[PDB]
Amino acid sequence: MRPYTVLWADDEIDLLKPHILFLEQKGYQVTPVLSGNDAIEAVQNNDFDIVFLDENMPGIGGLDALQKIKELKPYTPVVMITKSEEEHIMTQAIGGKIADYLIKPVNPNQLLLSLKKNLQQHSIISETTNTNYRQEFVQLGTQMSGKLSFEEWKELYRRIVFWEIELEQADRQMGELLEMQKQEANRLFARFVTQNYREWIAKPDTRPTMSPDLFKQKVFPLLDNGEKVFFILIDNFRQDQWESVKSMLSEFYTFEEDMYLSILPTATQYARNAIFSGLMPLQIEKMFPDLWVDEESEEGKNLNEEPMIRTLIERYRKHYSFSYNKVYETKFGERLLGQIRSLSQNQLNVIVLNFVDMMSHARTDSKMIRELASNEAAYRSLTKSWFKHSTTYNLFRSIAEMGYKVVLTTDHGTIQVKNPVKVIGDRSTNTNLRYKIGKNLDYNPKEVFEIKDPASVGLPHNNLSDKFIFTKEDDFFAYPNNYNYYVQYYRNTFQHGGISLEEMLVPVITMQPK
Amino acid sequence: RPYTVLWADDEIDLLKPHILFLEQKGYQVTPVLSGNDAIEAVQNNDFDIVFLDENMPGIGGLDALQKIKELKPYTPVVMITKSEEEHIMTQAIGGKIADYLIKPVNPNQLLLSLKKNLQQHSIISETTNTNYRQEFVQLGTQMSGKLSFEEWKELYRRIVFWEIELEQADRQMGELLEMQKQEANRLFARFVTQNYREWIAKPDTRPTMSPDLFKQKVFPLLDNGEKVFFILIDNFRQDQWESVKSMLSEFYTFEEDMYLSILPTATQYARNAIFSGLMPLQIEKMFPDLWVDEESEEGKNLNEEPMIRTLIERYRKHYSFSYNKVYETKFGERLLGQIRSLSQNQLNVIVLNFVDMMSHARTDSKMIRELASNEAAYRSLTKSWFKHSTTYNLFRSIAEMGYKVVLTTDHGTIQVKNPVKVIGDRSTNTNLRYKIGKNLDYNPKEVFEIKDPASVGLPHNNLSDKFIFTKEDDFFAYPNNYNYYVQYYRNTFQHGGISLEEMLVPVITMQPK
Ligand code: BEF
Ligand code: BEF
Ligand code: BEF
Ligand code: BEF
Ligand SMILES: [Mg+2]
Ligand SMILES: [Mg+2]
Ligand SMILES: [Mg+2]
Ligand SMILES: [Mg+2]
Ligand SMILES: [Zn+2]
Ligand SMILES: [Zn+2]
Ligand SMILES: [Zn+2]
């Protein structure tokens, strides 16, 4: 290697000769200077790896030297090594983007620690992530194997996502080894769902929490305990997207993290209507035929969610005051943000955000989103940018100021599809690549989850359709009339409505304002 | 509220003085004696910060760190230990500790660490606010008077720096800077309009511009017998460079500089000028086979590789070189594989294209409006695209080849605000910031007006063909449906006119570490 270079500025550098010898023995080149002006010049005309800085020096002070050095080379770490214990100096150093602040007398090893932490942090963390994943990779495969409970599935998926993000900043083949494990997880999760889905619908008392159960399990207990709640539903928000925005929200909230199961199809007109109605889609139609819109109509499929909310509140003999707001466009979030505090009168404030859904679909037809979200790390990254720079960030921030509980959840996720499944003859479901509705559908029954009795899984259908077929894993339906184009166009896009961990196992977070 | 600290040390009884000190300072400390006790405490509470001994009976502090970061990844952990072994330091760093303090620890060092890890964001805001209020004065005197080109580069670099710094500060301070930026752009437009003709007419005395870029910044390197990668990112302005330079600092050291794009600040003219070494006009007369009239339907920057060849010929050089355009991040994969095969050449040209902001597709329009509503968001998208596209590894891999890299752009872009009325035919171009026209109508005091394109190296078809250019953050708007197109194009990013963002663009000479 080459040695890391250290520029050290102190009016009494002679008193630090022992420390300089120690660092020089550990492979570091130290250039000493005696003033801020000499340190500034050295930084200007050199490319030092790190800068050590005294505060009290004849001439300009370290805090003033720090400002200049940060404008010249803001990416260069600066450590303040001073005898000052004044809080004012600490405060201004932190504010000046100091990397470390060490109070004299300093143990030389404390300087070694700063040098490693501030110059080799990334490679150290990278090597530990690989090492830790190598240790735990086996434990994850076996944890996967066998017959897992629902709660065991939650923790496994939680563990897989964690490694998805950790291994972004680590070795490649560790990352593609995780992809294999994730692939195997989705396969085994698919069997878990198809073997139990009909029973889940049949026996509502022994089933995991699903869309129709969401409000009863996670909202009503809060409201019944006297608490004021903001139910915020970001449509098409996967588990790994929650993990991406989690740290940002931690500045303002504490979390109780949970997950729950979306119903099939993992689509908005079914799962999200089931949430706000508290019922399986078929039960919405029977009990409230005026609020259900069947898949044929050109009318909107989720325009009646507020009335559904009122029937659910009434259906459990609750008297909650509530509001419902639906946000698509950029301007309407700023407007809702402006009128946010007028909602303080209501116990329950429901907010639906549709942009991640829009963006997720734009991964198919928008060259721009094909660039910004080429892979799932970019998609997560792009989700961070949106959350921070849209009005969503300050919306969550204003709610916290209002002393409101927030239940942050979604209706379904989405998955990056890879391999086609042939199909033909459906009705009006060509728009969805993960589920299909119709009669006389030619397909391979081995490749899908067949629902020939839709009313058994709480699904309505008009007389021109009698069955549902769902994809599994990362498959997507493809027609043969324009097959080769169809396949090249939709491969690697994001699609929902089928069976996968990404689509079905989705977050529900109960957040308390700090 | 009081900040809460979880402190796990098997000798917690000897740390009672530190604890009392910290309780006097307003913190609530919870003492525990082992890694398992701490793990359980974190599991059932929301502590703000964790202090962690390493050597304890039971599990080691390092084992506790791994589990606590799993439970509360967003909670800072400070290791406070007597151990001075290097492998312990390294392992704790790997375990994502916030700090590592070797015993005995100054109690003020605990306080500092609590400020730096629990209140650093709000501290940086107040400090940035206070610093800028003071620097606001020097930026006023620095843009006062008549500035030289070198002074315009310093000032523009200064304004960009504070633009990004003030992302983390009070809104009012950003408003205050926004107006200093307005004034800078107003004065910069005067500076350009008063000198642009002189610059084109006197090549030996002008600032470095598009047609001079290769001679000024590339040929000297090669002539000094050093290999070079010339990477041109389309529509990559100064603050986008400032947004990605830290990522690049892990593999390069920088010689940062700027240069002026010619007008229009549009790929068809500026980038062709860079590669041809000539002005867009004299492209056609010097080289008919190379030029493409703007009015031809097929692409205009497809035969740039031959333009580069004639440039090498004109200056009597014999560089072996390559040329590669990467439209999409998928094509970049192939280039990344074959990238080491380009070690044979002295010069390697790569054209990268950042997301098209000219997209009229309804979906792109809806994305753009939400993902890039302001300049902070635009920079954030820029960083995201750079890291997760093939661009990041591309620079990473070129560094391993030990090549010098010249990173630059052909022009920038600006967020437009106010409409400027203009009347023209169906023929007239779509660009919001500049028009070409046989019969253009406009307030000549609202634009930079080039009645004879031929004098400034621009082509034309008719005697009556003009070029007109917007300044500051103006954008052209036609009378038909003027009210609608004003509302649609306002706050969108455009290029082709006169502004610091469009015109004064980065050129970085980078040395692999
Ligand atoms: F003089 Be220094 F601040 F220790
Ligand atoms: F719009 Be939904 F997520 F199908
Ligand atoms: F016992 Be601890 F590591 F100081
Ligand atoms: F023609 Be480029 F988009 F400026
Ligand atoms: Mg001193
Ligand atoms: Mg002084
Ligand atoms: Mg101990
Ligand atoms: Mg032990
Ligand atoms: Zn949805
Ligand atoms: Zn959707
Ligand atoms: Zn361009």
Question: Structure tokens of A46?
Answer: 């050199």
The distance from CA A390 to its chain's CA centroid, rounded to whole angstroms, is 15
Could you give the 3-state DSSP secondary structure of residue A148? coil
Q: Kindly state the helix (H) or strand (E) to which residue B434 belongs, with its residue range.
A: strand B434-437
Residues constituting chain A? 514
Q: ∠ CA(B275), CA(B277), CA(B279), 5° rounding? A: 105
What tokens does B119 get? 């209140």
Provide φ and ψ at A62, rounded to 5°: -60, -40
Distances from the Cα of B184 to the Cα of B125, B159, B160, B266, angstroms: 25, 9, 11, 22
Taking alpha carbons only, the member of B159, B507, B246, B151 closest to residue A73 is B246
Q: Beta A405-409 vs A505-513: how paired, if at all? A: antiparallel
* B359 interaction partners in chain A (CB closer than 8 Å): 367-368
For chain B, how big is the Rg over CA atoms in Å?
Answer: 28
List B257's β-bridge partners, or say none. Answer: B507
Q: How far apart are the first and last CA of chain B?
A: 47
Residues A446/A502, Cβ–Cβ less than 8 Å: no
Q: Residue B497: which residues within 8 A CB-CB, separation 6 or more?
A: B263, B264, B265, B414, B433, B434, B469, B470, B471, B474
Alpha-carbon distance B53 to B101, whole Å? 10
What are the residues whose beta carbons fall under 8 Å from the beta carbon of A503, sequence distance 6 or more?
A: A262, A266, A412, A413, A414, A415, A434, A496, A497
* B329·A107 Cβ contact <8 A: no
Cα atoms found within 13 Å of the Cα of residue B184, Cβ hemisphere only:
26
DSSP secondary structure string for all residues of B69-104: HHH-TTS-EEEEES---HHHHHHHHHTT-SEEEESS
Spell out a b/e string for A325-342, using b for 16 or more CB atoms within 10 Å of the CB, else e: bbbeebeebbebbeebee
- Classify strands B347-353 and B441-442 as parallel, antiparallel or unpaired: unpaired
Neighbours of B470 (CB within 10 A): 29
B367–A367 CB contact, under 8 Å = no
Which residues make Cβ contacts (< 8 Å) with residue B500, sequence separation at least 6? B156, B159, B181, B184, B185, B188, B238
What distance in Å separates the CA atoms of residue A451 and residue A445, rounded to the nearest whole number?
11
The structure tokens listed for A405 are 């509980």
**Could you please report the per-residue DSSP string of B383-418?**
HHHHHHSTHHHHHHHHHHTT-EEEEE-S---EE--E
Amino acid at A285: E
Residue B273 and residue B266 in contact, taking contact as beta carbons nearer than 8 Å: no
Which of the 8 DSSP states describes residue A512?
A: E
> What type of residue is A347?
Q
Contacts of A343 (CB under 8 A, 6+ apart): A323, A349
Return the ∠ at Cα A355 (arms to A349 and A356), rounded to 5°: 105
Phi, psi of B52 (to 5 degrees): -140, 110
> Helix H segments across B149-201?
149-165, 171-201
CA B262 from chain centre, in angstroms, equals 21
Residue B79 bridge partners (DSSP)? B52, B100
Look up the domain containing B55 and give its range.
4-122
Contacts of residue A10, Cβ cutoff 8 Å, sequence gap at least 6:
A16, A32, A34, A52, A54, A57, A81
Q: How far is A17 from B404, CA to CA, in rounded Å?
A: 38
Q: How far apart are CA B505 and CA B241, in angstroms?
A: 9
Q: Which tokens hold the place of B319? A: 């560089």
C-alpha distances (whole Å) from A164 to each of A18, A56, B92, B380, B423 are 45, 47, 22, 22, 55
Query: Does residue A389 contact residue A381 with C-beta atoms inside 8 Å?
Result: no
**Residues paired with B325 in a beta bridge:** B351
Distance CA A443, CA A434 (A): 13
The answer to whether the CB of B506 falls within 8 A of the CB of B241 is yes
Upstream peptide bond of A208 is cis (omega within 30 degrees of 0): no
Can you tell me the distance from the alpha carbon of A307 to that of A319, in angstroms, rounded to the nearest whole number?
Answer: 14
N- to C-terminal Cα separation, chain A: 47
DSSP class of B328:
S
- Residue A43 Ramachandran class (φ > 0 left, ψ -120 to 50 alpha, else beta): alpha
Residue corresponding to tokens 């240069």: B259
Q: Which two tokens stand for residue B64?
A: 């506790």
| Amino acid type, B163 | E
> Which residue, B419, B411, B500, B457, is CA-closest to B191?
B500
Please tell me the distance from the alpha carbon of residue B408 to that of residue B506, in angstroms, as a whole number: 6
Contact A372, B384 (CB under 8 A): yes
Residues of B in contact with A125 (CB under 8 A): 93-94, 96
Element (H, E) at A7: strand A5-9
The upper half-sphere exposure of residue B461, i.e. CA atoms within 13 Å in the direction of its Cβ, equals 11
Distance, in Å, from the CA atom of B149 to the CA atom of A138, rounded to the nearest integer, reads 62
Neighbouring residues of B6: CB distance < 8 A, sequence distance ≥ 6: B30, B32, B38, B41, B42, B45, B47, B49, B50, B51
Of B96, B100, B119, the CB nearest to A125: B96
**A57, HSE (Cβ side, Cα atoms, 13 Å):** 27
Q: Is B497 helix (H, G, I), strand (E, B) or coil?
A: coil
Which residue reads 């097959």 in tokens?
Answer: A483
- CATH number, residue B65: 3.40.50.2300
Q: Are B488 and B383 in contact (CB under 8 A)?
A: no
Parallel, antiparallel, or unpaired: how do β-strands A419-422 and A475-478 relate? parallel
Give, in degrees to the nearest 5, the angle at Cα B77 between B74 and B79. 165
Which residues are CB-neighbours of A19 under 8 A, at least 6 positions away?
A106, A108, A111
Query: Does ligand 1 have an atom closer than 6 angstroms to the CB of A397?
Result: no
> How large is the angle between the packed helices A87-95 and A62-72, nearest 10 degrees?
10
Q: Does residue B50 sit in helix, strand or coil? A: strand
In angstroms, the CA B30 to CA B27 distance is 10
Interchain pair A382, B376: CB under 8 A: no
Is the Cβ–Cβ distance between A441 and A464 less than 8 Å?
no
| DSSP symbols for A222-282 | HHHTT--EEEEEESS--HHHHHHHHHHHHTTEEEEEEEEEPPSS-SIIIIIHHHHHTS-HH
Residues 6+ apart with CB under 8 A from A298: none
Residues of chain A with Cβ-Cβ distance to B389 below 8 Å are 371, 374, 378
Please tell me if the CB atom of residue A302 comes closer than 6 angstroms to any atom of ligand 2: no
Residue ranges of B for the binding site?
9-11, 53, 55-56, 58, 167, 234, 267, 318, 356, 360, 410-411, 451, 463, 495
Strand order in B321-326's β-sheet? B252-260, B504-512, B404-408, B228-234, B347-353, B321-326
**Which SS3 state, helix, strand or coil, does residue A326 take?**
strand
Shortest CA distance to A378 belongs to which of A365, A360, A357?
A: A360
Residues of B in contact with A76 (CB under 8 A): 249
10 Å Cβ neighbour count for B402?
A: 11
Helix (H) or strand (E) holding B437: strand B434-437
Largest CA distance in chain B: 92
Minimum CA–CA partner of B368 in chain A: A368
3-state secondary structure of B423: strand
| Cα–Cα distance, B168 to A274 (Å, whole number) | 41
Q: Which stretch of DSSP H or E encloses residue B304?
A: helix B304-314
Distance A44 CA to ligand 6 centre (A): 21
For atom 4 of ligand 1, the residue with the nearest CA is A82
What distance in angstroms lies between residue B110's CA and the mean position of ligand 7's atoms?
Answer: 17
Indicate the resolution in Å: 2.4
Q: Which of B191, B163, B190 is nearest to B179 (CA)?
A: B163
- State the amino acid at position A282 in one-letter form: L
Beta-bridge partner residues of B274: none
Torsion sign across C-alpha atoms A439, A444, A450, A452: positive
Angstrom distances, CA of residue A466 to CA of A198, A360, B440: 17, 30, 64
Q: How far is CA A204 from the centre of its chain?
A: 29
In the block, tokens 């035919």 appear at B425
With CB atoms and an 8 Å threshold, state whether B46 touches A254. yes
Solved by what technique? Answer: X-ray
